[PDB]
Amino acid sequence: SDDVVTFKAQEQLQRASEQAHNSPVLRALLAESLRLFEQVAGSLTPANLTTAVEQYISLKYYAGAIQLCLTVAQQKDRGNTALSWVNDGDSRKKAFDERKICYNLIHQVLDKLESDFAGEPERPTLAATKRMEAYNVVNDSSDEVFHFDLYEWYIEKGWTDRILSIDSPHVITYLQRLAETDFRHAELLCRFYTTRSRFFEAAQVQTNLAKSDLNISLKDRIILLSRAKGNASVNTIGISRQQQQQLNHEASELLEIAHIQDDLLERLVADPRIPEERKAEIEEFLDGPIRTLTDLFNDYADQANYYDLCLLIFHAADFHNPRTILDTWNNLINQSHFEAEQRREYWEIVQAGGDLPAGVIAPIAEPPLPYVYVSQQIQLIAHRTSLDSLIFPVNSLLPVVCAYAINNGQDASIGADPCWPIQLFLNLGVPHALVVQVLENVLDTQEAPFTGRRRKLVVQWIAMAVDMWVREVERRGAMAASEAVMGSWVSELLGRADQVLTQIAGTGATLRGGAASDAEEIASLRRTVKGLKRSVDMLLGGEMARMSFFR
Ligand code: NA
């Protein structure tokens, strides 16, 4: 430890500079200086180590200088105090800081190593050998604290590719701990995992990062979840597929909630009926971590009467309350109708050359009739949630849409196909048998507005639904088979409907003011319904194929 050995170490290194022209002697003096320095490594002052490293650099002794720094580092902290003080988080700042002085010198050597060899080719040159020996010392070192400080240095430089090709396990430990605190380092870890074909772990990083309290925008959190769902939908080696689908499910649920929050935040900020003093606080609370469905509903979607987003929340939350779901559909239908009606009015004023109210901006292109806009809102939710949902109870929802169409005159008086409710549900994929089942119930229970002469339209709906049904049976060539199927009950319904029609004709002929004008319409509809009943009876009286529908 004492002074003579140190002086003789410096003496050898001095003589080495004087013998640069004699390569065997230069190499021997340098090794001897290194040997003596390592003997007194625990006692070397920062200034002595610095001068020695500088002279070693001048003589191209890169690897030996680094080995000396690493030897000094361990000897001043043989208990590995800095490692434990780091794996935790104080007077052990003595052990870590003394080590870091050695580590900073190593950075110095490596910087000069690259500068002296920049623009030279990799038998290997002596420069290639010195590079190999120097980085063998660095990378084969067991000082994992040194490696942590080294990785931090590479990152501060932007030398990203050098981090990724590290074949050591210490770099995993380093990135995993700084991913919990900084968004940047978490990305390297995922880039580290995936290139090594480890997608599930990268999905776990991205997921916990999407759930973290770091500063991440909602839209960036959606990107992380979209990524994780993908990395967690394909199994990397050696993890139970029954745990893959676990992470894939979690990322999927969060992604669903996150998109509802994103659509909710986008609408609130753009809403003219929301005051600005509220919008800043809205963006502050929604553009960040993902909220609970309960909070998104009670504090935002419900208050704002965003009935479509409420229905998406009910779907995501497995909310079991058919009454609330149906009432929310009713509010969405009526809200959408009222909005579409006002845009039509303003458009019609422009077409007629009228005057708009002050400040009103009319649609520049023809806006949809109210039932078209209503249908669009229904279809948007259907394509987003699928019909396999509790927010699509056809038995309850189809009568609500049908009642809307009658009560609001969305019929041929505005140019609409009177059967648009039925075409809507059929085009969404609702099976024909279920639609006719609902329409059978509507015809038999006679609840307003499905009363009086308006039951003519209900028969029109039945005829249309059955027409499209037999056409689809003829197209497929087979009838798939208490899920309702085509049977005698359909034929009985069509027969029954004939009595409804003659009853409606009779009350029409005697209306106060003159006979109704739909006498021939009803007569033709009677013939149409009877023709459909023949087709149904022929399909049932036949033997044609009943066919397959696998799960
Ligand atoms: Na508004």
514, part of any domain = yes
Please check whether residues 134 and 49 belong to one and the same domain.
yes
290, 257 Cβ separation under 8 angstroms: yes
Query: How many angstroms does the Cα of residue 271 sit away from the middle of ligand 1?
Result: 5
Q: What angle do CA 351, 357, 363 make, to 5 degrees?
A: 45
Half-sphere exposure of 400 (CA within 13 A, CB side): 20
Query: How many angstroms does the Cα of residue 347 sit away from the middle of ligand 1?
Result: 19
DSSP string, 155-207: HHHT-HHHHHT---SHHHHHHHHHHTT-HHHHHHHHHHHHHTT-HHHHHHHHH
Spatial CA neighbour of 307 closest among 283, 324, 285 = 324
441, 498 Cβ separation under 8 angstroms: no
171, part of any domain = no
Query: How many angstroms does the Cα of residue 30 sit away from the middle of ligand 1?
Result: 81
Query: How many angstroms does the Cα of residue 315 sit away from the middle of ligand 1?
Result: 24
CATH number of the domain encompassing residue 193 = 1.25.40.440
Resolution value in angstroms: 2.1
Please check whether residues 113 and 225 belong to one and the same domain.
no
Please check whether residues 87 and 61 belong to one and the same domain.
yes
Half-sphere exposure of 195 (CA within 13 A, CB side): 12
Residue 251 is encoded by which pair of tokens? Answer: 């990322």
Q: What angle do CA 394, 400, 401 make, to 5 degrees?
A: 85
Query: How many angstroms does the Cα of residue 304 sit away from the middle of ligand 1?
Result: 8
User: What contacts 24, CB < 8 A, 6 or more positions away?
Assistant: none
Query: How many angstroms does the Cα of residue 411 sit away from the middle of ligand 1?
Result: 28
Spatial CA neighbour of 521 closest among 504, 546, 534, 535 = 504
Please check whether residues 42 and 101 belong to one and the same domain.
yes
Query: How many angstroms does the Cα of residue 339 sit away from the middle of ligand 1?
Result: 10
Please check whether residues 7 and 109 belong to one and the same domain.
yes
CB atoms within 10 A of CB 263: 16
Please check whether residues 283 and 154 belong to one and the same domain.
no
Radius of gyration for the chain, computed over Cα atoms and rounded to the nearest angstrom: 40
113, 62 Cβ separation under 8 angstroms: yes
Query: How many angstroms does the Cα of residue 423 sit away from the middle of ligand 1?
Result: 31
DSSP string, 309-362: HHHHHHHHTT---HHHHHHHHHHHHHHHHHHHHHHHHHHHHHHTT-PPPTT---
Query: How many angstroms does the Cα of residue 269 sit away from the middle of ligand 1?
Result: 11
CB atoms within 10 A of CB 237: 7
501, part of any domain = yes
Query: How many angstroms does the Cα of residue 100 sit away from the middle of ligand 1?
Result: 61
Please check whether residues 10 and 153 belong to one and the same domain.
yes
- H-type alpha helices, 40-92: 46-58, 62-75, 81-88
CB atoms within 10 A of CB 177: 15
Query: How many angstroms does the Cα of residue 272 sit away from the middle of ligand 1?
Result: 5
Name the residue with tokens 């039509």. Answer: 344
Query: How many angstroms does the Cα of residue 371 sit away from the middle of ligand 1?
Result: 21
Q: What are phi and psi of 242, to 5 degrees?
A: -70, -10
Please check whether residues 374 and 232 belong to one and the same domain.
no
Residue 108 is encoded by which pair of tokens? Answer: 């110095």
Query: How many angstroms does the Cα of residue 358 sit away from the middle of ligand 1?
Result: 18
Query: How many angstroms does the Cα of residue 305 sit away from the middle of ligand 1?
Result: 9
Query: How many angstroms does the Cα of residue 273 sit away from the middle of ligand 1?
Result: 4
107, 79 Cβ separation under 8 angstroms: no
Spatial CA neighbour of 388 closest among 472, 318, 323 = 318
Q: Taking the mean position of all CA atoms in its chain, how far away is CA 395?
A: 33
172, part of any domain = no
55, part of any domain = yes
Query: How many angstroms does the Cα of residue 256 sit away from the middle of ligand 1?
Result: 25
Spatial CA neighbour of 10 closest among 28, 25, 29 = 29
151, 171 Cβ separation under 8 angstroms: yes
Residue 280 is encoded by which pair of tokens? Answer: 């800043």
310, part of any domain = no
Query: How many angstroms does the Cα of residue 259 sit away from the middle of ligand 1?
Result: 21
Query: How many angstroms does the Cα of residue 479 sit away from the middle of ligand 1?
Result: 49
Amino acid 490 reads V
- Distance between CA atoms of residues 550 and 548, nearest Å: 6
Please check whether residues 287 and 330 belong to one and the same domain.
no
Could you list which residues have their CB under 5 Å from ion ligand 1? 271, 273
Query: How many angstroms does the Cα of residue 311 sit away from the middle of ligand 1?
Result: 19
Please check whether residues 411 and 488 belong to one and the same domain.
no
Residue 209 is encoded by which pair of tokens? Answer: 């990062």
Query: How many angstroms does the Cα of residue 421 sit away from the middle of ligand 1?
Result: 27
- Distance between CA atoms of residues 466 and 481, nearest Å: 17
DSSP string, 230-266: HHTSSPPTTS-HHHHHHHHHHHHHHHHHHHHHHHHHH
CB atoms within 10 A of CB 522: 20
Domain that holds residue 13: 3-163
- Compute the residue count for the chain: 551
Query: How many angstroms does the Cα of residue 274 sit away from the middle of ligand 1?
Result: 7
Q: What are phi and psi of 376, to 5 degrees?
A: -60, -40
Query: How many angstroms does the Cα of residue 101 sit away from the middle of ligand 1?
Result: 64
300, part of any domain = yes
Query: H/E element holding 528?
Result: helix 519-541
Calculate helix-pair angle for 432-445, 455-476, nearest 10 degrees: 160
Which of 270, 304, 338 corresponds to the end of one domain? 304
Query: How many angstroms does the Cα of residue 306 sit away from the middle of ligand 1?
Result: 10
C-alpha pair distances (Å), 390 with each of 213, 436, 543: 33, 20, 37
Query: How many angstroms does the Cα of residue 393 sit away from the middle of ligand 1?
Result: 29
Q: What angle do CA 507, 510, 511 make, to 5 degrees?
A: 85
Query: How many angstroms does the Cα of residue 364 sit away from the middle of ligand 1?
Result: 20
Name the residue with tokens 């990203």. Answer: 160
Residue burial 496-505, b: 16+ Cβ < 10 Å; e: rest? ebeebbeebb
Spatial CA neighbour of 429 closest among 461, 389, 462, 396 = 389
Please check whether residues 148 and 195 belong to one and the same domain.
no
Query: How many angstroms does the Cα of residue 407 sit away from the middle of ligand 1?
Result: 25
Name the residue with tokens 């410096």. Answer: 10
C-alpha pair distances (Å), 223 with each of 81, 227, 252, 285: 40, 6, 12, 19
- Distance between CA atoms of residues 222 and 338, nearest Å: 34
Query: How many angstroms does the Cα of residue 266 sit away from the middle of ligand 1?
Result: 13
Query: How many angstroms does the Cα of residue 332 sit away from the middle of ligand 1?
Result: 14
Q: What angle do CA 481, 487, 493 make, to 5 degrees?
A: 140
- Distance between CA atoms of residues 141 and 143, nearest Å: 5
Please check whether residues 390 and 443 belong to one and the same domain.
no
Spatial CA neighbour of 233 closest among 222, 248, 223 = 248
Query: How many angstroms does the Cα of residue 283 sit away from the middle of ligand 1?
Result: 17
371, 424 Cβ separation under 8 angstroms: no
- Distance between CA atoms of residues 247 and 252, nearest Å: 8
DSSP-derived letter for residue 299 is: I
442, 397 Cβ separation under 8 angstroms: no
- Distance between CA atoms of residues 170 and 179, nearest Å: 15
What is the 3-state composition of the chain as percent helix, strand, coil, each rounded to the nearest 5?
Answer: 70, 0, 30
DSSP-derived letter for residue 547 is: -
- Distance between CA atoms of residues 528 and 461, nearest Å: 12
- Quote the number of domains for the chain: 4
Q: Mapping DSSP to helix (H, G, I), strand (E, B) and coil, where does residue 223 land?
A: helix
76, 108 Cβ separation under 8 angstroms: no
Query: How many angstroms does the Cα of residue 366 sit away from the middle of ligand 1?
Result: 21
169, part of any domain = no
Query: How many angstroms does the Cα of residue 337 sit away from the middle of ligand 1?
Result: 15
Q: Mapping DSSP to helix (H, G, I), strand (E, B) and coil, where does residue 22 land?
A: coil
Name the residue with tokens 């992470």. Answer: 247
Which of 381, 407, 427 corresponds to the end of one domain? 427
Which of 259, 275, 304 corresponds to the end of one domain? 304
462, 438 Cβ separation under 8 angstroms: no
Q: Mapping DSSP to helix (H, G, I), strand (E, B) and coil, where does residue 276 land?
A: helix
Calculate helix-pair angle for 370-385, 394-407, nearest 10 degrees: 170
407, 377 Cβ separation under 8 angstroms: no
